[PDB]
Design a protein around this ligand. Structure first.
Ligand SMILES: [Zn+2]
Ligand SMILES: [Zn+2]
Lengths: 67, 39, 32, 45, 60, 45, 42
């Protein structure tokens, strides 16, 4: 739904690296190189950013219920 | 629509990745099939 | 220019101190 | 003798006679319909 | 609407202010009415207006 | 006495248990209650 | 010409799913029923 704050397995904070990851991918870097540049060594952390699906961008497209 | 910046970036990444996959996977398959043929 | 435009002998100088068909690059929109 | 009303036939969603066949992508959100919904079912009660 | 001293005016609704009418404002309105030679609404008519507004606001 | 919110235009209003269930300004038939004024506390776990 | 690989087969399958969809049979059957079947039943 939205990038988790901590890696499930170990507990490293990965919630502050989603925007940087997208910026790096925008510049043409490969996914492995982008994850390496963010200093994500353990594959337990790498799966958190690699396999995250961002669904909040789909929930936000609905008109807000209040105003 | 006025899509958000993250969505536009994701769309660009998806287009690039689709093109790169369509090239590299096809090239690897062509490389493998000729080797399997000559064996 | 890129790695392809490099001379083949100079490419041979790039030695690690090939793609495989079953490792796709991740996507987000898929297709259909 | 003219158009006499004989009944009401339930409409399959996303079919040719459904209101969602048109409306594009943007208006599908204003109607609170998921664009991933595929139709093919009826709504009875 | 119309000021007593001034003439008739057609105004939109938002021109009025939610703030209460002050003592000098009502005094000036009374002085303008006296200058024109007009009177103030009767207390019976004031009660009739109050009942009309209460009926209208609580109507279903 | 209790607030309500329209389902289409998100307009706040109130009802007196005798008005028809309807938005005053767009005539929508579906309205929602507003959130309670009580304190809401969570354990952050 | 040139040989056809697996990726071309997946391109063709993608075209199939782009046109038809996954529930095309339900919608096609219902459209056929509404367009012509009711009139013939009458
Ligand atoms: Zn970890
Ligand atoms: Zn409304």
């Amino acid at each position: 739904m939205i990038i988790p704050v901590r890696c499930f397995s170990c507990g490293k904070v990965v919630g502050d690296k989603w925007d940087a990851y997208l910026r790096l991918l925008e510049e043409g870097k490969q996914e492995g190189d982008a994850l390496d540049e963010l200093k994500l060594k353990r594959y337990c952390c790498r799966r958190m950013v690699l396999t995250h699906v961002d669904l909040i961008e789909k929930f936000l497209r609905y008109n807000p219920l209040e105003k | 629509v006025v899509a958000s910046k993250a969505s536009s970036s994701m769309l660009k990444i998806d287009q690039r990745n689709k093109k790169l996959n369509n090239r590299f996977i096809r090239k690897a398959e062509m490389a493998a099939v000729e080797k399997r043929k000559l064996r | 220019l890129a790695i392809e435009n490099l001379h083949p002998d100079d490419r041979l100088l790039l030695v690690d101190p090939s793609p495989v068909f079953f490792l796709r690059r991740p996507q987000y929109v898929s297709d259909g | 003798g003219n158009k006499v009303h004989i009944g009401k036939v339930p409409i399959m969603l996303r079919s040719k006679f459904c209101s969602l066949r048109t409306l594009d992508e943007v208006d599908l959100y204003k109607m609170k319909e998921c664009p991933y919904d595929m139709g093919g079912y009826f709504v009875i009660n | 609407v119309a000021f007593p001293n001034q003439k008739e005016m057609v105004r939109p609704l938002f021109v009025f202010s939610d703030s209460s009418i002050t003592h000098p404002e009502f005094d000036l309105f009374l002085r303008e009415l006296d200058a024109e030679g007009l009177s103030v609404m009767d207390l019976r008519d004031v009660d009739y207006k109050y009942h009309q507004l209460k009926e209208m606001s609580s109507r279903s | 006495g209790v607030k309500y919110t329209c389902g289409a235009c998100a307009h706040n209003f109130s009802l007196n248990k005798s008005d028809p269930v309807r938005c005053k300004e767009c005539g929508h038939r579906v309205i929602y209650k507003a959130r309670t004024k009580r304190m809401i506390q969570f354990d952050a776990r | 010409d040139d040989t056809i690989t697996t990726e071309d087969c997946w391109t063709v399958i993608s075209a199939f799913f782009e046109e038809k969809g996954l529930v095309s049979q339900q919608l096609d059957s219902f459209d056929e029923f509404m367009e012509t079947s009711i009139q013939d039943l009458v």
